[PDB]
Write a protein that binds this ligand. Sequence first.
Ligand SMILES: *[C@@H]1O[C@H](CO)[C@@H](O[C@@H]2O[C@H](CO)[C@@H](O)[C@H](O)[C@H]2NC(C)=O)[C@H](O)[C@H]1NC(C)=O
Ligand SMILES: *[C@@H]1O[C@H](CO)[C@@H](O)[C@H](O)[C@H]1NC(C)=O
Ligand SMILES: *[C@@H]1O[C@H](CO)[C@@H](O)[C@H](O)[C@H]1NC(C)=O
Ligand SMILES: *[C@@H]1O[C@H](CO)[C@@H](O)[C@H](O)[C@H]1NC(C)=O
Ligand SMILES: *[C@@H]1O[C@H](CO)[C@@H](O)[C@H](O)[C@H]1NC(C)=O
Ligand SMILES: *[C@@H]1O[C@H](CO)[C@@H](O)[C@H](O)[C@H]1NC(C)=O
Ligand SMILES: *[C@@H]1O[C@H](CO)[C@@H](O)[C@H](O)[C@H]1NC(C)=O
Ligand SMILES: *[C@@H]1O[C@H](CO)[C@@H](O)[C@H](O)[C@H]1NC(C)=O
Lengths: 543, 542
Amino acid sequence: ELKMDQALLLIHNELLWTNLTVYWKSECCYHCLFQVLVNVPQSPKAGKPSAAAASVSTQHGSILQLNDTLEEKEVCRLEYRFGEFGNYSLLVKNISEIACDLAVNEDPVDSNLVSIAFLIGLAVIIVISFLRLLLSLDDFNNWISKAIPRLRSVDTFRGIALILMVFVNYGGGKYWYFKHASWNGLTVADLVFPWFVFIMGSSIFLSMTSILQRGCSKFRLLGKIAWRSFLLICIGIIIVNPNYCLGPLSWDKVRIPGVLQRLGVTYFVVAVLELLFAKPVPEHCSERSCLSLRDITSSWPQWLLILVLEGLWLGLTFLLPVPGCPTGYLGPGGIGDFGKYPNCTGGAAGYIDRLLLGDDHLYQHPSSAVLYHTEVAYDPEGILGTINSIVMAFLGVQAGKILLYYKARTKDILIRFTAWCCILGLISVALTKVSENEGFIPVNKNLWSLSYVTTLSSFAFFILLVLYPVVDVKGLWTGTPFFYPGMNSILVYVGHEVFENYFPFQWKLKDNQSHKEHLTQNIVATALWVLIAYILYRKKIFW
Amino acid sequence: AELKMDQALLLIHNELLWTNLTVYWKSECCYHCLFQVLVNVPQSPKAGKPSAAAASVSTQHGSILQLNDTLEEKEVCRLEYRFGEFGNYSLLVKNIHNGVSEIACDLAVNEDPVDSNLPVSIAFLIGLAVIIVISFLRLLLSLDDFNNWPRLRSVDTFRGIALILMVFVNYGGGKYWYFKHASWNGLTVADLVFPWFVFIMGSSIFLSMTSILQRGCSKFRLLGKIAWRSFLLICIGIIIVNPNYCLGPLSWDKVRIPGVLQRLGVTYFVVAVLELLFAKPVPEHCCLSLRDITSSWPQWLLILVLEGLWLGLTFLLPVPGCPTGYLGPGGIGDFGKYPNCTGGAAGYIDRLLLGDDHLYQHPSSAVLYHTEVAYDPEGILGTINSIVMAFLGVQAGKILLYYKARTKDILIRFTAWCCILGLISVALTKVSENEGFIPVNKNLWSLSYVTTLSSFAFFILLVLYPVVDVKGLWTGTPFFYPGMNSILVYVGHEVFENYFPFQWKLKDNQSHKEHLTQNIVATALWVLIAYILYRKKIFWKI
Ligand SMILES: *[C@@H]1O[C@H](CO)[C@@H](O[C@@H]2O[C@H](CO)[C@@H](O)[C@H](O)[C@H]2NC(C)=O)[C@H](O)[C@H]1NC(C)=O
Ligand SMILES: *[C@@H]1O[C@H](CO)[C@@H](O)[C@H](O)[C@H]1NC(C)=O
Ligand SMILES: *[C@@H]1O[C@H](CO)[C@@H](O)[C@H](O)[C@H]1NC(C)=O
Ligand SMILES: *[C@@H]1O[C@H](CO)[C@@H](O)[C@H](O)[C@H]1NC(C)=O
Ligand SMILES: *[C@@H]1O[C@H](CO)[C@@H](O)[C@H](O)[C@H]1NC(C)=O
Ligand SMILES: *[C@@H]1O[C@H](CO)[C@@H](O)[C@H](O)[C@H]1NC(C)=O
Ligand SMILES: *[C@@H]1O[C@H](CO)[C@@H](O)[C@H](O)[C@H]1NC(C)=O
Ligand SMILES: *[C@@H]1O[C@H](CO)[C@@H](O)[C@H](O)[C@H]1NC(C)=O
């Protein structure tokens, strides 16, 4: 009967002649219309109330409304939070004063700390497997004997981001907080691509300045950058269009925008801009010497270009009119905002995509469709969000500039990192207030809002601040399993994108509707990808 | 019409007043197939008004029609027509003047298109090939302004040809029966593509191995590299031969273990280690000396022993429910007396070791012989035969290497080997492809199959060695780019087999022209990708 995160609900009417209809609304909505859930017939006789089952989602919160169809007067309003695999028999009865007694026939099953014990057992098994692999490596070394630097902080951060991306791209255990949130708000899966872009820009600066310090030509670097960007865009367009179930995709239903396309475009833009404005690293300098402030001043034209682009983004989002839609719209449409704007997903950001690339070429299953029941096609990797992607890539480039201008000065690097983190956090707090949904520019992924970029950049700066002393300066724990994907980021990304549908990466499940099975499947698949990255790192075949 | 692709309509009219008419059908290329009920036409109720019923007889190749009266099980008539694609082919049966009731079956045709030609492929031959070449030329001319602002090439060309043919036939090849694996015994264009790749793989093994030994390296480093490459090939093959496009992902107990890449990796390891354990330095040649065999008589004896083992297991090992030594297709084969006997002892070993679940469930005989059991072509004894073929490739490499100075001894040895292998194939097969001792078969990897394809590979090398390497008339301009990226391109099209540039919705889903255009476009796309990879000097080769 029930499946996944769906707790059955029993409704019995003990009223007399007020035929009842119940209504449902998720708690996470900002303004959703009360969509109908199930009807309740009139009681056939006194002392014999009728019944009517239902299936209410138990992910996060639940608001129940019971408004009679004969007279629009709410019998009762309930804001209970249902649990997974519950029974939750609900009774409505009169005391004129209609009461609503809610009972729990069966206790809901606990998940995400049963689930804790399963996770601990899986971790123990993984530790045992790692020990066995180490023993096998030692045996191979003994047999051979018998027969006979990017600072690693950038690498570890990119590896962490890529591994989290792989885990959340396999479903992430199908948890509500391990997949992209419906529109506004931040989840674990909403933090892994911005970190990838940030660290990718930092790697762009590090590699480019290392090459320019070494013997190379600017035009050769430009050619390499153009070729790599074109290859990334081509592979993205190829891999964001499977035909596993539907017939082969036609010449028009092809989806142009994608994750790798956005990565290639932002890489090309920021790399060409940096080649246009690239100077040898100055030796501006003992003690703090905070008066230097050379990283920001030495690259003013790039900052001017970034500010111009972001002003363009703000103007287009809050000023450009949209036909049949209020100007400066940020909501998700559908049943959101009381359904007054059925087709306004993204506002101007989606309007530009629909005007340029057409409706059929965009992501036909937006992340907001599950919650807001929207019908318009919206692509999160759209056209107007490329401005913010470029902005965050340049922020990563600035982080690399800070990390490399002060080659061996831990105090200055930490001070600059914490200053940038505090500034970006203050900007984000000012923009989004403190409520996720409320504010000037609420944090969002589908629009790549400025508050989203600032929040993720501040988080990335804090992660770098806590990682650099641990990994490079002091060498506490040198990210043992993480930089192997840190070296083969793009290869591993393409690998799990194209190998997502095969045997070892996903198999038949005894319990199809269960968090534990999906979690222990995705964890094994991600660990397999870590193992593959490690194997390719042993061969020194970095690409 | 409303018919399927490669299927001819068959309208039957009855003029009999006392017998229910049953029509049987059997394709001409069966060796011994039973007759299965195609359609039943009832007797005409009213005199002068024939009963009407329709059937869709397959028009792939050949057709035999037998009409049996269900009243007394008697013979009525017998046709041996060859139907045409998307035809009409109305058939009527009637008596001759009602004299002696000697009823006859006369066939009439109303429309029949023609296939297996170049109706529009001629226009496509230069319609886009010239444009792509011009576009490439324009980029090179523009790049110069922006910029301003030996090797064998014959083994590589042959490997590229074989790889391109495998790519073409793995995408359907226009759905023709030429470019598809034959039903059990028999040869097609798609049956010639894999053993040539194995042959070239062995030859390249010997070439690279002798080159690295002459450069100077430890034998154990090579052994480790070979073992790791074999393990990598086997692993990726196991990963890629199990797609879960079905509604339910493959279970733990239904994964298909054997595959093409498993075969390739196992033969790679076996023959490479065999060559390593008996790798002698090449003598300094100074015409009529049989040195290529007396320098490797140990591994030659080993290969002969392996062939003897294969023959003994195939022709002697008893099988429960099957005769001791069998080669029949299986279902409705050999007059249907052996329902589940596909492969005999060559498939019984597969079932015993790997289990029935872990094998290929839609073998190439299931389309014509209507078999029901699962038999994986890449079995266990097929591994022995593929090892033999790769060893013959190593022998060809030895011939090409030892006599590196003169181009006369090389051609003499290639033609001698080709003649001997062709003679062995003719003796075994008797040149009938159905009877004989060991008929040429791809599913079983028959010894005659290996000898035939080794002779063909030797002739191809004979024609491509002077023209490409020696005289320099040709250099394999579009084909040797996959020559040095065989493994990468194979894995690529096996994983990218279903995506937008390689698979797009068709205007009509059942027409050879559209399928041929799509498959040729995809193969050209893979040629272009291999070219781009070659331009960047990125080489990963087994
Ligand atoms: C169709 O009719 C033919 C001819 O009557 C059948 O062929 C005979 O089958 C019997 C077995 O029942 C054999 O003993 C004869 O040797 C066959 N040939 C003759 C009589 O000439 C045939 O079996 C019938 N059924 C099918 C499916 O073909
Ligand atoms: C159910 O509500 C409808 C109102 O449209 C009406 O038939 C009646 O009030 C209820 N039914 C019964 C049987 O009382
Ligand atoms: C019943 O409840 C609301 C109160 O919020 C009332 O205004 C309306 O008539 C009913 N709601 C719906 C969705 O029918
Ligand atoms: C829920 O509780 C009701 C109360 O009687 C019971 O009839 C029903 O079987 C229960 N369902 C489940 C799934 O436990
Ligand atoms: C919204 O779009 C859907 C299809 O995307 C269409 O059916 C519907 O009529 C549109 N409604 C408005 C108000 O534009
Ligand atoms: C034979 O044909 C007659 C008339 O055509 C029909 O009544 C009878 O059922 C048929 N019998 C069989 C076995 O088909
Ligand atoms: C075959 O011809 C008949 C007339 O002889 C016609 O009625 C029928 O439609 C034709 N079949 C097809 C598939 O067109
Ligand atoms: C052949 O195998 C099938 C597998 O489904 C089985 O049903 C059939 O009985 C087998 N044939 C014989 C003669 O046992």
